[PDB]
Design a binder for this molecule. Structure first.
Ligand SMILES: NC(=O)c1ccc[n+]([C@@H]2O[C@H](COP(=O)([O-])OP(=O)(O)OC[C@H]3O[C@@H](n4cnc5c(N)ncnc54)[C@H](O)[C@@H]3O)[C@@H](O)[C@H]2O)c1
Ligand SMILES: NC(=O)c1ccc[n+]([C@@H]2O[C@H](COP(=O)([O-])OP(=O)(O)OC[C@H]3O[C@@H](n4cnc5c(N)ncnc54)[C@H](O)[C@@H]3O)[C@@H](O)[C@H]2O)c1
Ligand SMILES: NC(=O)c1ccc[n+]([C@@H]2O[C@H](COP(=O)([O-])OP(=O)(O)OC[C@H]3O[C@@H](n4cnc5c(N)ncnc54)[C@H](O)[C@@H]3O)[C@@H](O)[C@H]2O)c1
Ligand SMILES: [Zn+2]
Ligand SMILES: [Zn+2]
Ligand SMILES: [Zn+2]
Ligand SMILES: [Zn+2]
Lengths: 333, 333, 333, 333
């Protein structure tokens, strides 16, 4: 129902578009990318090394990108304030380039007639939402918002359930994360982040992440109670979170399993998964959950100190949450 | 000085043999491996995908393996009780096949004339030793011992320093671990451990490990205070430990850095390393430390709750510790 | 329609089973594998790192493996002459273990009541067949046959078309081949084939193959005119043939493209594919063609000397050809 | 003797610098790279994922990069015509950015006082030289020259020997090539070469190359007689050439081995290697040969039609040839 524009046709832009057409919850009507012409867009959308060939039809016709017979207007503007979203009918714009994450910069899309802007990344100052956690705090006065990061969307739903039931005193998170586009095939320049320049095929690479701290924004009672770090490893997709936390109320591991499984079947269905299967990362490729609790992999030292494991398709889970968030916003109009 | 036999000419058997000849601390005089004949041993020892070509000479001569001009008796026995270690002059035997890790099974080497046996792996019942941590507890009545695991040798020196200075109330460990010979190139059978059969090149694979619990055997005061788990990831060598612990006495992260650095320059020199450089895993390939604390990668939530990161070459550090252990044993005879 | 037993539930056994149910062309009614019990079979068949979760249902019930509601008798015999195929109603048996590839050994399945045996690998003595090339030479007198290799199934249909139209004077093939189960995660023992023991993740590994020579068996006119070799590279699936040949009749590259495309739309439809897209190996993952000609990738030096490139999913193409061969056999009785 | 500046401190720029300090044949006195400042250069030079830590000392002092006690002037200019090479005493400049490969663009270094320029890549118009093949055709009138590509340096020495002894009528080349810095970690934009944008970890990627045709420039008698293509595969370093050629004179494979071994021990020593060992790509990491003939890997169809295999460390062999070529140029002044 709501008509959507996508700024950037990178991994996130293309998979948000894919999720939109797969789920049908929103209608994509425009895309902007200065570095990718129409014929090339067709190729990049249709073929995907990680998620396979698109399920449906894609073609160029009359200067438009036509996906499942739905024509999409293509822009090639470097300056977001110059994109004519309004003339194309785009109401919501997904800001997925990674370089306009502030209110100031993302807000440029409004000048072109966009009504609201969803930043598909953390923002220094735009309000952040995580589906299943605080999305009900959204309201119509908000024209520029953020859907946080893939890792925060993994951690927050699980932290919510654990905190609601047992109370997190403090927690430290590690994420073992699949490689991304910001990394390098061989040792190359990454001036602000030296480790991240090192060859991605050859190395386990430690990295900082604000994702754990960010959970404190979407779950205010956990402000200051979580932090963490990441390791990048040479897999193409799917990542995993390891949350080590101290609990205030006693929590037998079997009681933890019960409340997570109950959450996965009710209010967080589709967002927080639960499995007891002997899974490995490839079993979550193209999985649309934000977070899937791995009952078998986690371990408790005692009833107050536990390590909890949750898998996430860092591409597909997040992409589908952007769509879900827009669908929720549209329902509130 | 002490003459050594190696059972199992694998990753660890070969690299123990390299360490012995590179350091000169022990003399290898016999090798048994029923799945590698003499001419094949020359090839497997000389060329190493991970650590490069052997620096030295290796050839087959008169039915012996000759390394740097030293002849080595070669056995081809499946049954360890049948290996004639005594005839070859092997006084200590490194049990590095992976399949004889109880005192009962490893003790078979005594029937062929070995005086002592060092199991290159955790043992359900053999006393375990970690160089720098409890090796001075070894005494001459122990004919069969264990050098623990690569992961225990990483965690224990660091845990020793943290516990000695601040005390560890409780800790949970994750290791991000390189692939090993027990894993599979593509999805295949592993009936006792289903996740471990899944393709190692494609997957992040959670795995159980007793390594953190074993730290409580080499540091008795930590008995019951540590446990953990592992993720196998697609790198051919070098692993990393992530220790999340609660301290009984408060420490600023700078205090922790100070005492670890001091330990690495003094009593744990060569065993525990310390760095502030922007390292990645390949920077530790062929590094002979048991453990190298990564000061920049770690993070503290508060003065009592911290995540400490330490790197280890799981092949090369451990192999050198096996040699160091035997040298220390021989000094006690 | 024909009822089928599978000996060995491995990459090929499982994917033959998956192809049978996906296509519906034969009915699997029995499976034997001593190293994978019933509950483990469910897991190994349902989850696949390479091809994703099975599209359908799989469970254990009443001692049977049930796939899409169809019950399958499960055997656990090490000795093929003891498998009761007849009692389970299996008429054809796919011998996919890799260790019974001679007529003498594969013939053991006839003792337990199977009528015909199809060896899913080259055989020293069983007649070999490639669908689209010589399958019409099959006849009802043949009780034990071979479906050749994945590489032979890629090369032969392409060779057939080129030879039929232009005449191959001589040809040399290279295949760049994905890793397989016979390879090793780290440098390990492979006594008959030393290079194949070297770590698969770390190495390009040259290997001998009789695949090109074997084309001269399924296309007798090409006996002695083709041979080749392979390079194993660190990808989990999908391989590619590079055929360099001298042609007797002049052949502009556009003429080669024309006759290959024509073949792909006619007698070889589903076996030999044709593309002009800018493809890479992952675009062929789960592609059921034996061979897909890459028009853009090949190159001609002149009208008589050309290099032709053809892609193949070595797992899925071959599996589907085993099923197609059995369906063809069944149509003759 | 000759003093050298390096433009572009990348894989080749850094390894040229390493090769220069290791061999002592030339003196590096200046480096330009606008994307790598002085402190970062220390780090990038000292640590190398592929070739390990620099053996020697490296530090920043007084605004100079100091390698083994030798100070190097550091420039940060995007525009090559603005680099003050003369002031720094740099007589020859290695042009290794990958973006100034024509004589007109590379000639910009003369404006800042360089005397000669060596392009570390093929050039559309600069004369190309391969050490051991046509470097004696260099003369003092050539102020801007090219060292060709890594692949051309592998193929040309081998082709010289084969052509000299047996005569190459025609040949077709495939190179199975390690990934490079121009490739992408995950599917991303490569608008001119779509396949090259596809994830390098996940894919075998076909690519065009002028390397075989270029052999016809450095060996004029082979003009028009060779072409070829490449497959990029997921390994971080070391590549291999597969040369399929028709010979005019009969050449038993043992005779081919004889004359290649002879060349490797005499006129082409240090450039063309020869092995009969069971090698794999990692055995050539940091190998300084341009080309190493793999006797056991090649195969003959008959006396006039053969496939010859040669390995090359695409980073390290080539970097050493750049240094060798500059020292030879200096000897002609
Ligand atoms: N690889 C590491 O990082 C590492 C580190 C610490 C400890 N370990 C442990 O060392 C031991 C060996 O591990 P690995 O990585 O070297 O494995 P590996 O497979 O590379 O080597 C084991 C070997 O022993 C041989 N062997 C098998 N059965 C034998 C028998 N009956 N008699 C004699 N030889 C036999 C095999 O042919 C092979 O060479 C294991 O217990 C392992 O858990 C490994
Ligand atoms: N994987 C490919 O790309 C491919 C392609 C074409 C042909 N092939 C051929 O198919 C055959 C199987 O190859 P794979 O890739 O599936 O290897 P695999 O290791 O995955 O399969 C072998 C299976 O056979 C089982 N097995 C072993 N011994 C057995 C016995 N006595 N009785 C019953 N089952 C037994 C094993 O448990 C295993 O599951 C080989 O001959 C191979 O050359 C493989
Ligand atoms: N890597 C190989 O295997 C190999 C082998 C032979 C030749 N080459 C060729 O050598 C050249 C460099 O290749 P590479 O693999 O080292 O790539 P690279 O990306 O690792 O290095 C390029 C370097 O040049 C720098 N640079 C970019 N623009 C610059 C500018 N205007 N001025 C100064 N520096 C600039 C970059 O920061 C980078 O450090 C290319 O032409 C390549 O084709 C590469
Ligand atoms: Zn306190
Ligand atoms: Zn036979
Ligand atoms: Zn019938
Ligand atoms: Zn000084």
């Amino acid at each position: 129902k709501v008509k959507v524009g996508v700024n950037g046709f990178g991994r996130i832009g293309r998979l948000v578009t894919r999720a939109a057409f797969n789920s049908g919850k929103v209608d994509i009507v425009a895309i902007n990318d200065p570095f990718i012409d129409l014929n090339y867009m067709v190729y990049m959308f249709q073929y995907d090394s990680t998620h396979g060939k698109f399920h449906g039809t894609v073609k160029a016709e009359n200067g438009k990108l036509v996906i499942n017979g739905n024509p999409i207007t293509i822009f090639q503007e470097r300056d977001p304030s110059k994109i004519k979203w309004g003339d194309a009918g785009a109401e919501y714009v997904v800001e997925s380039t990674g370089v306009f994450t502030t209110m100031e910069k993302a807000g440029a899309h409004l000048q072109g007639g966009a009504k609201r802007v969803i930043i598909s990344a953390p923002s220094a100052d735009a309000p952040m939402f995580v589906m299943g956690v605080n999305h009900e705090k959204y309201d119509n006065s908000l024209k520029i918002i953020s859907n946080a990061s893939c890792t925060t969307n993994c951690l927050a739903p699980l932290a919510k359930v654990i905190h609601d039931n047992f109370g997190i005193v403090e927690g430290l998170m590690t994420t073992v994360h699949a490689i991304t586009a910001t990394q390098k095939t061989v040792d190359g320049p990454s001036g602000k982040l030296w480790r991240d320049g090192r060859g991605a095929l050859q190395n386990i690479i430690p990295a900082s992440t604000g994702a754990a701290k960010a959970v404190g924004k979407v779950i205010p009672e956990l402000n200051g109670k979580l932090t963490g770090m990441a390791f990048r490893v040479p897999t193409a997709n799917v990542s995993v979170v390891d949350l080590t936390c101290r609990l205030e109320k006693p929590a037998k591991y079997d009681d933890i399993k019960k409340v997570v499984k109950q959450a996965s079947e009710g209010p967080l269905k589709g967002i927080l998964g639960y499995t007891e299967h002997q899974v490995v990362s490839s079993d979550f490729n193209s999985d649309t959950h934000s977070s899937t609790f791995d009952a078998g992999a986690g371990i408790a030292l005692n009833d107050h100190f536990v390590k909890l494991i949750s898998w996430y398709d860092n591409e597909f889970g997040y992409s589908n949450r952007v769509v879900d968030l827009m669908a929720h916003m549209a329902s509130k109009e």
